[PDB]
Coordinates of N, CA and C and ligand atoms in Angstrom, one line a residue:
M1 N 102.7 133.0 95.4 CA 103.9 132.8 96.2 C 104.6 131.5 95.9
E2 N 105.9 131.4 96.1 CA 106.6 130.2 95.7 C 107.3 129.6 96.9
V3 N 106.9 130.0 98.1 CA 107.4 129.5 99.4 C 106.8 128.1 99.7
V4 N 107.6 127.3 100.4 CA 107.2 126.0 100.9 C 107.6 125.9 102.3
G5 N 106.9 125.1 103.1 CA 107.2 124.9 104.5 C 108.5 124.0 104.7
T6 N 108.8 123.8 105.9 CA 109.9 122.9 106.2 C 109.5 121.8 107.2
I7 N 110.2 120.7 107.4 CA 110.0 119.8 108.4 C 111.0 119.9 109.5
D8 N 110.6 119.6 110.7 CA 111.6 119.6 111.8 C 111.5 118.3 112.7
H9 N 112.3 118.2 113.7 CA 112.3 117.0 114.5 C 110.9 116.7 115.1
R10 N 110.2 117.7 115.5 CA 108.8 117.6 116.1 C 107.9 116.9 115.1
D11 N 108.0 117.3 113.8 CA 107.1 116.7 112.8 C 107.3 115.2 112.7
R12 N 108.6 114.8 112.7 CA 108.9 113.4 112.6 C 108.5 112.6 113.9
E13 N 108.7 113.3 115.0 CA 108.4 112.7 116.3 C 106.9 112.4 116.4
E14 N 106.1 113.4 116.0 CA 104.6 113.2 116.1 C 104.1 112.2 115.1
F15 N 104.8 112.2 113.9 CA 104.4 111.1 112.9 C 104.7 109.7 113.5
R16 N 105.8 109.5 114.2 CA 106.1 108.2 114.7 C 105.2 107.8 115.9
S17 N 104.8 108.8 116.7 CA 104.0 108.6 117.8 C 102.6 108.4 117.4
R18 N 102.0 109.2 116.6 CA 100.6 109.2 116.2 C 100.3 108.4 115.0
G19 N 101.2 108.3 114.1 CA 101.0 107.6 112.8 C 100.6 108.4 111.7
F20 N 100.5 109.7 111.9 CA 100.2 110.7 110.9 C 100.8 112.0 111.2
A21 N 100.8 112.9 110.2 CA 101.4 114.3 110.5 C 100.8 115.2 109.5
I22 N 100.6 116.5 109.9 CA 100.1 117.5 109.0 C 101.3 118.4 108.6
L23 N 101.4 118.6 107.3 CA 102.4 119.5 106.8 C 101.7 120.7 106.1
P24 N 101.7 121.9 106.7 CA 100.9 123.0 106.3 C 101.1 123.4 104.8
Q25 N 102.3 123.3 104.3 CA 102.5 123.8 102.9 C 103.7 123.0 102.3
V26 N 103.3 121.8 101.7 CA 104.3 121.0 101.0 C 104.5 121.4 99.5
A27 N 103.4 122.0 99.0 CA 103.5 122.5 97.6 C 103.2 124.0 97.7
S28 N 104.0 124.7 96.9 CA 103.8 126.2 96.8 C 102.6 126.5 96.1
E29 N 102.2 127.8 96.2 CA 101.0 128.3 95.5 C 101.1 128.1 94.0
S30 N 102.3 128.3 93.5 CA 102.5 128.1 92.0 C 102.5 126.6 91.6
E31 N 103.0 125.8 92.5 CA 103.0 124.3 92.2 C 101.5 123.8 92.3
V32 N 100.8 124.3 93.3 CA 99.3 124.0 93.3 C 98.6 124.5 92.1
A33 N 98.9 125.7 91.6 CA 98.3 126.2 90.4 C 98.5 125.3 89.2
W34 N 99.7 124.8 89.1 CA 100.1 123.9 88.0 C 99.4 122.5 88.1
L35 N 99.3 122.0 89.4 CA 98.7 120.8 89.6 C 97.2 120.9 89.3
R36 N 96.6 122.0 89.6 CA 95.2 122.2 89.3 C 94.9 122.2 87.8
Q37 N 95.8 122.8 87.0 CA 95.6 122.8 85.6 C 95.8 121.4 85.0
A38 N 96.7 120.7 85.6 CA 96.9 119.3 85.2 C 95.6 118.4 85.5
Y39 N 95.0 118.7 86.6 CA 93.8 117.9 87.0 C 92.6 118.4 86.1
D40 N 92.6 119.6 85.7 CA 91.5 120.1 84.8 C 91.5 119.3 83.5
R41 N 92.6 118.7 83.1 CA 92.7 117.9 81.9 C 92.6 116.4 82.2
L42 N 93.1 116.0 83.4 CA 93.0 114.6 83.8 C 91.6 114.2 84.1
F43 N 90.9 115.1 84.7 CA 89.5 114.9 85.2 C 88.5 115.7 84.5
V44 N 88.1 115.3 83.3 CA 87.2 116.0 82.5 C 85.8 115.7 82.9
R45 N 85.0 116.8 83.3 CA 83.6 116.6 83.6 C 82.9 116.7 82.3
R46 N 82.2 115.6 81.9 CA 81.6 115.5 80.6 C 80.1 115.4 80.7
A47 N 79.4 116.1 79.8 CA 77.9 116.1 79.7 C 77.4 115.0 78.8
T48 N 76.1 114.7 79.1 CA 75.3 113.8 78.2 C 74.1 114.5 77.8
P49 N 73.3 114.0 76.8 CA 72.1 114.7 76.4 C 71.1 114.8 77.5
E50 N 72.9 113.2 83.3 CA 73.9 113.4 84.3 C 75.3 113.4 83.8
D51 N 76.1 114.4 84.3 CA 77.5 114.5 84.0 C 78.2 113.3 84.5
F52 N 79.4 113.0 84.0 CA 80.3 112.0 84.5 C 81.7 112.5 84.2
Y53 N 82.6 112.0 85.1 CA 84.0 112.3 84.8 C 84.5 111.3 83.9
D54 N 85.2 111.7 82.8 CA 85.6 110.9 81.7 C 86.8 110.1 82.0
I55 N 86.8 109.2 82.9 CA 87.9 108.3 83.3 C 87.4 106.9 83.5
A56 N 88.3 106.0 83.5 CA 88.0 104.6 83.9 C 87.5 104.6 85.3
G57 N 86.4 103.8 85.5 CA 85.8 103.7 86.8 C 84.5 104.5 86.9
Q58 N 84.4 105.5 86.0 CA 83.3 106.4 86.0 C 82.4 106.3 84.8
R59 N 83.0 106.4 83.6 CA 82.3 106.3 82.3 C 81.8 104.9 82.1
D60 N 82.3 103.9 82.8 CA 81.9 102.5 82.6 C 81.4 101.9 83.9
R61 N 81.0 102.7 84.8 CA 80.6 102.2 86.1 C 79.1 101.7 86.2
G62 N 76.5 100.1 89.0 CA 76.3 100.1 90.4 C 76.5 101.5 91.0
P63 N 76.6 101.5 92.4 CA 76.8 102.8 93.0 C 78.1 103.5 92.5
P64 N 78.1 104.9 92.5 CA 79.2 105.6 92.0 C 80.5 105.3 92.8
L65 N 81.6 105.4 92.0 CA 82.9 105.3 92.7 C 83.6 106.6 92.8
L66 N 84.4 106.8 93.7 CA 85.2 108.0 93.9 C 86.1 108.1 92.6
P67 N 86.0 109.3 91.9 CA 86.8 109.4 90.7 C 88.3 109.4 91.1
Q68 N 89.0 108.5 90.5 CA 90.5 108.4 90.8 C 91.3 107.8 89.6
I69 N 92.5 108.2 89.6 CA 93.4 107.8 88.6 C 94.7 107.2 89.2
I70 N 94.9 105.9 89.1 CA 96.1 105.2 89.6 C 97.2 105.6 88.7
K71 N 98.4 105.9 89.3 CA 99.6 106.3 88.6 C 99.3 107.3 87.5
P72 N 98.8 108.5 87.8 CA 98.6 109.6 86.8 C 99.9 110.0 86.1
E73 N 101.0 109.7 86.7 CA 102.3 110.0 86.1 C 102.5 109.3 84.8
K74 N 101.7 108.3 84.5 CA 101.7 107.7 83.1 C 101.2 108.7 82.1
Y75 N 100.2 109.5 82.4 CA 99.6 110.4 81.5 C 100.3 111.8 81.6
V76 N 100.7 112.1 82.8 CA 101.4 113.4 83.1 C 102.8 113.1 83.7
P77 N 103.8 112.7 82.8 CA 105.1 112.3 83.3 C 105.9 113.5 83.7
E78 N 105.4 114.7 83.6 CA 106.0 115.9 84.2 C 105.9 115.9 85.7
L79 N 105.0 115.0 86.2 CA 104.8 114.9 87.6 C 106.0 114.5 88.5
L80 N 106.6 113.4 88.1 CA 107.7 112.8 89.0 C 109.0 113.5 88.7
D81 N 109.1 114.5 87.8 CA 110.3 115.3 87.6 C 110.3 116.3 88.7
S82 N 109.2 116.7 89.3 CA 109.0 117.9 90.0 C 109.7 118.1 91.3
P83 N 110.0 119.4 91.6 CA 110.5 119.7 93.0 C 109.6 119.2 94.1
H84 N 108.3 119.1 93.8 CA 107.4 118.6 94.8 C 107.6 117.1 95.1
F85 N 107.8 116.4 94.0 CA 108.0 115.0 94.2 C 109.3 114.8 95.0
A86 N 110.4 115.5 94.6 CA 111.7 115.3 95.3 C 111.6 115.7 96.7
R87 N 110.8 116.7 97.0 CA 110.6 117.2 98.4 C 109.9 116.2 99.2
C88 N 108.9 115.6 98.6 CA 108.1 114.5 99.3 C 108.9 113.3 99.5
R89 N 109.8 112.9 98.5 CA 110.7 111.7 98.7 C 111.6 111.9 99.9
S90 N 112.1 113.2 100.0 CA 113.0 113.5 101.1 C 112.3 113.4 102.5
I91 N 111.0 113.9 102.5 CA 110.2 113.8 103.7 C 110.0 112.3 104.0
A92 N 109.7 111.5 103.1 CA 109.4 110.1 103.3 C 110.7 109.4 103.9
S93 N 111.8 109.8 103.3 CA 113.1 109.3 103.8 C 113.3 109.6 105.2
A94 N 113.1 110.9 105.6 CA 113.2 111.3 107.0 C 112.3 110.6 107.9
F95 N 111.0 110.4 107.5 CA 110.0 109.8 108.3 C 110.2 108.3 108.5
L96 N 110.7 107.7 107.4 CA 110.9 106.2 107.5 C 112.3 105.7 107.9
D97 N 113.2 106.7 108.0 CA 114.6 106.4 108.3 C 115.2 105.4 107.2
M98 N 114.9 105.8 106.0 CA 115.4 105.0 104.9 C 116.0 105.9 103.8
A99 N 117.0 105.4 103.1 CA 117.6 106.2 102.1 C 116.6 106.4 100.9
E100 N 116.6 107.5 100.3 CA 115.7 107.8 99.2 C 115.8 106.8 98.1
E101 N 117.0 106.3 97.9 CA 117.2 105.3 96.8 C 116.6 104.0 97.1
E102 N 116.2 103.7 98.4 CA 115.6 102.5 98.8 C 114.1 102.5 98.6
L103 N 113.5 103.7 98.4 CA 112.1 103.8 98.3 C 111.5 103.5 96.9
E104 N 110.6 102.6 96.9 CA 109.7 102.5 95.7 C 108.6 103.5 95.8
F105 N 108.0 103.9 94.7 CA 107.0 105.0 94.8 C 106.0 104.9 93.6
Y106 N 104.8 105.5 93.8 CA 103.9 105.8 92.7 C 102.9 106.9 93.1
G107 N 102.2 107.4 92.2 CA 101.3 108.5 92.4 C 99.9 108.0 92.3
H108 N 98.9 108.8 92.8 CA 97.5 108.5 92.9 C 96.7 109.8 92.9
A109 N 95.8 110.0 91.9 CA 95.1 111.2 91.8 C 93.6 110.9 92.2
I110 N 93.1 111.8 93.0 CA 91.7 111.7 93.5 C 91.0 113.0 93.3
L111 N 89.7 112.9 92.8 CA 88.9 114.1 92.7 C 87.5 113.7 93.4
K112 N 87.2 114.4 94.4 CA 85.8 114.3 95.1 C 84.9 115.3 94.5
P113 N 83.9 114.8 93.7 CA 83.0 115.7 93.0 C 82.2 116.5 94.0
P114 N 81.6 117.7 93.6 CA 80.7 118.4 94.5 C 79.6 117.5 94.9
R115 N 79.2 117.7 96.2 CA 78.0 116.9 96.7 C 78.2 115.4 96.7
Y116 N 79.4 115.0 96.5 CA 79.7 113.5 96.5 C 79.4 113.0 97.9
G117 N 78.4 112.2 98.1 CA 77.8 111.8 99.4 C 78.3 110.6 100.0
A118 N 79.2 109.8 99.3 CA 79.8 108.6 100.0 C 81.1 109.0 100.7
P119 N 81.2 108.5 101.9 CA 82.5 108.6 102.6 C 83.5 107.6 102.1
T120 N 84.8 107.8 102.5 CA 85.7 106.8 102.4 C 85.8 106.1 103.7
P121 N 85.2 104.9 103.8 CA 85.0 104.3 105.2 C 86.4 104.0 105.9
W122 N 86.3 103.9 107.2 CA 87.5 103.6 108.0 C 88.2 102.4 107.3
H123 N 89.5 102.5 107.2 CA 90.4 101.4 106.7 C 91.8 101.6 107.0
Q124 N 92.6 100.6 106.9 CA 94.1 100.7 107.0 C 94.6 100.4 105.6
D125 N 95.5 101.2 105.1 CA 96.0 100.9 103.7 C 96.7 99.5 103.6
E126 N 97.3 99.1 104.7 CA 97.9 97.8 104.7 C 96.9 96.6 104.5
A127 N 95.6 96.9 104.8 CA 94.6 95.8 104.6 C 94.5 95.4 103.2
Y128 N 94.9 96.3 102.3 CA 94.9 96.0 100.8 C 96.1 95.2 100.4
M129 N 97.1 95.0 101.3 CA 98.3 94.4 100.9 C 98.5 92.9 101.2
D130 N 99.3 92.2 100.5 CA 99.6 90.8 100.6 C 100.2 90.5 102.0
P131 N 99.6 89.7 102.8 CA 100.1 89.5 104.2 C 101.4 88.7 104.2
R132 N 101.7 88.1 103.1 CA 102.9 87.3 102.9 C 104.2 88.2 102.8
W133 N 104.0 89.5 102.5 CA 105.2 90.4 102.2 C 105.0 91.7 102.9
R134 N 105.9 92.0 103.8 CA 105.7 93.3 104.6 C 106.5 94.4 104.0
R135 N 105.9 95.6 103.9 CA 106.7 96.7 103.4 C 106.5 97.8 104.5
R136 N 107.5 98.5 104.8 CA 107.4 99.8 105.5 C 107.0 100.9 104.5
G137 N 106.2 101.8 104.9 CA 105.8 102.8 104.0 C 104.8 103.8 104.5
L138 N 104.6 104.8 103.6 CA 103.6 105.8 104.0 C 103.0 106.5 102.7
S139 N 102.0 107.3 103.0 CA 101.4 108.1 101.9 C 101.5 109.6 102.3
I140 N 101.7 110.4 101.2 CA 101.7 111.8 101.4 C 100.6 112.4 100.5
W141 N 99.5 112.8 101.1 CA 98.3 113.3 100.5 C 98.3 114.8 100.4
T142 N 98.6 115.3 99.2 CA 98.7 116.8 99.0 C 97.4 117.3 98.5
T143 N 96.8 118.3 99.1 CA 95.5 118.7 98.6 C 95.7 119.9 97.7
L144 N 94.9 120.0 96.6 CA 94.9 121.1 95.7 C 93.9 122.2 96.1
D145 N 93.1 121.8 97.1 CA 92.0 122.7 97.5 C 91.9 122.8 99.0
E146 N 91.2 123.8 99.5 CA 90.9 123.7 100.9 C 90.3 122.3 101.2
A147 N 90.7 121.7 102.3 CA 90.2 120.5 102.8 C 89.6 120.7 104.2
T148 N 88.3 120.5 104.3 CA 87.6 120.7 105.6 C 86.9 119.4 106.0
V149 N 86.4 119.3 107.2 CA 85.6 118.2 107.6 C 84.4 118.0 106.6
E150 N 83.8 119.1 106.3 CA 82.6 119.1 105.4 C 82.9 118.8 103.9
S151 N 84.2 119.0 103.5 CA 84.6 118.8 102.1 C 85.2 117.4 101.9
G152 N 85.4 116.7 103.0 CA 85.9 115.3 103.0 C 87.4 115.2 103.3
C153 N 87.9 116.0 104.3 CA 89.3 115.8 104.7 C 89.5 114.5 105.4
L154 N 90.7 114.1 105.6 CA 91.0 112.8 106.3 C 90.9 112.9 107.8
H155 N 90.5 111.8 108.4 CA 90.4 111.7 109.9 C 91.3 110.4 110.2
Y156 N 92.0 110.5 111.3 CA 92.9 109.4 111.7 C 92.6 108.8 113.1
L157 N 92.9 107.6 113.3 CA 93.0 107.0 114.7 C 94.4 107.1 115.2
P158 N 94.7 108.1 116.1 CA 96.1 108.3 116.6 C 96.6 107.0 117.2
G159 N 97.8 106.6 116.9 CA 98.4 105.5 117.5 C 98.0 104.1 116.9
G160 N 97.1 104.2 116.0 CA 96.5 102.9 115.4 C 97.5 102.1 114.6
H161 N 98.6 102.8 114.2 CA 99.6 102.1 113.4 C 100.4 101.1 114.3
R162 N 100.3 101.2 115.6 CA 101.0 100.2 116.5 C 100.0 99.1 116.9
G163 N 98.8 99.2 116.4 CA 97.8 98.2 116.7 C 97.8 97.1 115.6
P164 N 96.8 96.2 115.6 CA 96.8 95.2 114.5 C 96.3 95.8 113.2
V165 N 96.5 95.1 112.1 CA 95.6 95.3 110.9 C 94.3 94.7 111.3
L166 N 93.3 95.7 111.5 CA 92.0 95.4 112.0 C 91.2 94.5 111.0
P167 N 90.2 93.8 111.5 CA 89.4 93.1 110.6 C 88.7 94.0 109.5
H168 N 88.9 93.6 108.3 CA 88.3 94.4 107.2 C 87.3 93.5 106.4
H169 N 86.4 94.1 105.7 CA 85.5 93.4 104.8 C 85.3 94.2 103.6
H170 N 84.9 93.6 102.5 CA 84.5 94.4 101.3 C 83.2 95.1 101.6
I171 N 83.2 96.4 101.2 CA 81.9 97.2 101.3 C 80.8 96.4 100.7
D172 N 81.1 95.8 99.5 CA 80.2 94.9 98.8 C 81.1 93.7 98.3
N173 N 80.8 92.5 98.8 CA 81.6 91.3 98.4 C 81.4 91.0 96.9
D174 N 80.3 91.4 96.3 CA 80.1 91.3 94.8 C 80.4 92.5 94.0
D175 N 81.0 93.5 94.7 CA 81.4 94.7 94.0 C 82.7 95.2 94.7
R176 N 83.8 94.4 94.6 CA 85.0 94.6 95.4 C 85.7 95.9 95.1
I177 N 85.6 96.5 93.9 CA 86.3 97.7 93.5 C 85.9 98.9 94.4
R178 N 84.7 98.8 95.1 CA 84.3 99.9 96.0 C 85.2 100.0 97.2
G179 N 86.0 98.9 97.5 CA 87.0 99.0 98.5 C 86.7 98.2 99.7
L180 N 87.6 98.4 100.7 CA 87.5 97.7 102.0 C 87.1 98.6 103.1
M181 N 86.5 98.1 104.2 CA 86.3 98.9 105.4 C 86.4 98.1 106.7
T182 N 86.6 98.8 107.8 CA 86.6 98.1 109.1 C 85.5 98.8 109.9
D183 N 84.9 98.0 110.8 CA 83.9 98.5 111.8 C 84.6 98.8 113.1
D184 N 85.9 98.5 113.2 CA 86.6 98.4 114.5 C 87.4 99.6 114.8
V185 N 86.9 100.8 114.5 CA 87.4 102.1 114.9 C 86.4 102.9 115.6
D186 N 86.7 103.4 116.8 CA 85.8 104.2 117.6 C 85.9 105.7 117.1
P187 N 84.9 106.2 116.4 CA 84.9 107.5 115.8 C 85.2 108.6 116.8
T188 N 84.8 108.4 118.1 CA 85.1 109.5 119.1 C 86.6 109.6 119.4
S189 N 87.3 108.6 118.9 CA 88.8 108.7 119.1 C 89.5 109.3 117.9
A190 N 88.7 109.6 116.9 CA 89.3 110.1 115.6 C 89.7 111.6 115.8
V191 N 90.7 111.9 115.0 CA 91.2 113.3 114.9 C 91.2 113.8 113.4
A192 N 90.6 114.9 113.1 CA 90.5 115.4 111.8 C 91.6 116.3 111.4
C193 N 92.0 116.2 110.1 CA 93.1 117.0 109.6 C 92.8 117.9 108.4
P194 N 92.1 119.0 108.7 CA 91.8 120.0 107.7 C 93.1 120.6 107.2
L195 N 93.1 121.0 105.9 CA 94.3 121.6 105.2 C 93.9 122.7 104.4
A196 N 94.9 123.6 104.2 CA 94.8 124.7 103.2 C 95.4 124.1 101.9
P197 N 95.1 124.8 100.7 CA 95.7 124.3 99.5 C 97.2 124.2 99.5
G198 N 97.8 123.1 99.0 CA 99.2 122.9 99.1 C 99.7 122.2 100.4
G199 N 98.8 122.1 101.3 CA 99.0 121.3 102.6 C 99.0 119.9 102.3
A200 N 99.5 119.1 103.2 CA 99.5 117.6 103.1 C 99.3 116.9 104.4
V201 N 98.7 115.7 104.4 CA 98.8 114.9 105.5 C 99.6 113.7 105.1
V202 N 100.4 113.2 106.0 CA 101.2 112.0 105.8 C 100.8 110.9 106.8
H203 N 100.6 109.7 106.3 CA 100.3 108.6 107.2 C 100.9 107.3 106.9
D204 N 101.2 106.5 108.0 CA 101.7 105.2 107.9 C 100.8 104.2 107.2
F205 N 101.3 103.1 106.6 CA 100.5 102.1 106.0 C 99.5 101.5 107.0
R206 N 99.8 101.6 108.3 CA 98.9 100.9 109.2 C 98.0 101.9 110.0
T207 N 98.1 103.2 109.8 CA 97.2 104.1 110.5 C 95.8 104.1 110.0
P208 N 94.8 103.8 110.8 CA 93.4 103.8 110.3 C 93.0 105.2 109.9
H209 N 92.3 105.3 108.8 CA 91.8 106.7 108.4 C 90.5 106.6 107.7
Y210 N 89.8 107.7 107.6 CA 88.4 107.8 107.1 C 88.4 109.2 106.4
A211 N 87.5 109.3 105.4 CA 87.2 110.6 104.8 C 85.7 110.8 104.7
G212 N 85.3 111.9 105.1 CA 83.8 112.2 105.0 C 83.4 112.5 103.6
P213 N 82.1 112.6 103.4 CA 81.6 113.0 102.1 C 81.9 114.4 101.7
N214 N 81.8 114.8 100.5 CA 82.0 116.2 100.1 C 80.7 116.9 100.1
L215 N 80.3 117.6 101.2 CA 79.0 118.3 101.3 C 79.1 119.7 100.7
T216 N 80.1 120.0 99.9 CA 80.2 121.3 99.4 C 80.0 121.3 97.9
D217 N 79.8 122.5 97.3 CA 79.5 122.6 95.9 C 80.7 122.7 95.0
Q218 N 81.9 122.4 95.6 CA 83.2 122.5 94.9 C 83.9 121.2 94.9
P219 N 84.6 120.8 93.8 CA 85.4 119.6 93.8 C 86.5 119.7 94.7
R220 N 87.0 118.6 95.3 CA 88.1 118.6 96.2 C 89.1 117.6 95.6
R221 N 90.3 118.1 95.3 CA 91.3 117.3 94.6 C 92.5 117.0 95.5
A222 N 93.1 115.8 95.4 CA 94.3 115.4 96.2 C 95.2 114.7 95.3
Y223 N 96.5 114.9 95.5 CA 97.5 114.2 94.8 C 98.3 113.4 95.8
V224 N 98.3 112.1 95.7 CA 98.9 111.2 96.7 C 100.1 110.6 96.2
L225 N 101.2 110.7 97.0 CA 102.4 109.9 96.7 C 102.6 108.9 97.7
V226 N 102.9 107.7 97.3 CA 103.2 106.5 98.1 C 104.6 106.2 98.1
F227 N 105.3 106.0 99.2 CA 106.7 105.7 99.3 C 106.8 104.4 100.2
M228 N 107.6 103.5 99.7 CA 107.6 102.2 100.5 C 108.9 101.5 100.3
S229 N 109.2 100.6 101.2 CA 110.4 99.7 101.1 C 110.1 98.6 100.2
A230 N 111.2 97.9 99.8 CA 111.1 96.6 99.2 C 110.4 95.6 100.1
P231 N 109.7 94.6 99.6 CA 109.0 93.7 100.4 C 109.9 92.7 101.2
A232 N 109.5 92.4 102.4 CA 110.3 91.4 103.2 C 109.3 90.2 103.5
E233 N 109.9 89.0 103.5 CA 109.1 87.8 103.7 C 108.6 87.7 105.1
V234 N 107.3 87.5 105.3 CA 106.7 87.3 106.6 C 106.6 85.8 106.9
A235 N 107.2 85.4 108.0 CA 107.3 84.0 108.4 C 105.9 83.4 108.8
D236 N 105.1 84.2 109.5 CA 103.8 83.8 109.9 C 102.7 84.8 109.4
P237 N 102.3 84.6 108.2 CA 101.3 85.6 107.6 C 100.0 85.6 108.2
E238 N 99.4 86.8 108.4 CA 98.0 86.9 108.8 C 97.1 86.4 107.7
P239 N 95.9 85.8 108.1 CA 95.0 85.3 107.2 C 94.4 86.3 106.2
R240 N 94.0 87.5 106.7 CA 93.3 88.5 105.9 C 92.3 87.9 104.8
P241 N 91.2 87.3 105.3 CA 90.3 86.6 104.5 C 89.5 87.5 103.5
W242 N 89.6 88.8 103.7 CA 88.9 89.8 102.9 C 89.7 90.1 101.6
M243 N 90.9 89.5 101.5 CA 91.7 89.9 100.4 C 91.1 89.5 99.1
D244 N 91.2 90.4 98.1 CA 90.7 90.1 96.8 C 91.9 89.6 95.9
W245 N 92.0 88.2 95.8 CA 93.0 87.6 95.0 C 92.5 87.5 93.5
Ligands
NI301 NI1 93.7 104.9 102.5

């Protein structure tokens, strides 16, 4: 099928209120099929005489990292031409109350291997950003596969985008590429967002989120588009002592 869902006022309203939103079908079945074929080539599972995914971060990797490609549109420039990109930019515009032309953007590809046992710990995406420069923005996480709690779908802290950027620390101070985490989210307050293929979740830069391990025997792929404003000077910057400069 080639049908795609729509957004309405209620979608925007709950995004503003809760800091995240579920879009049941942002990519059509045929768009998902094409994205899957693209990932088949981007993420080559390669054998040795343990298999590894033949990308930076994996083939040269301490504990395993989540297989991911920053700005995959460099390798597959067919990506940002797409109706799916345009559709997502329009959604971002509606949700941020900003003209599409004002948005900076980039792509991000993720594959969670079968039986990948590490979670993505609680974090806010803004914790990765320079406290001297504020951007409004969001992420649109489009799944290529069923996403369930057991396969590693995202969980959010509703309303957390109106709270502080929580204290974060490196998972390993001597292995910073593993990323950041916060201990300051109550898991009983979390809400999970399972998705069908072609569905997406959208979240603000400040909404805390977590992803579980992939306890299933099938890879789980997501294509993430980030849309954001130009940076604005912050007069009194937060310390964020966990920042990797
Ligand atoms: Ni994140």
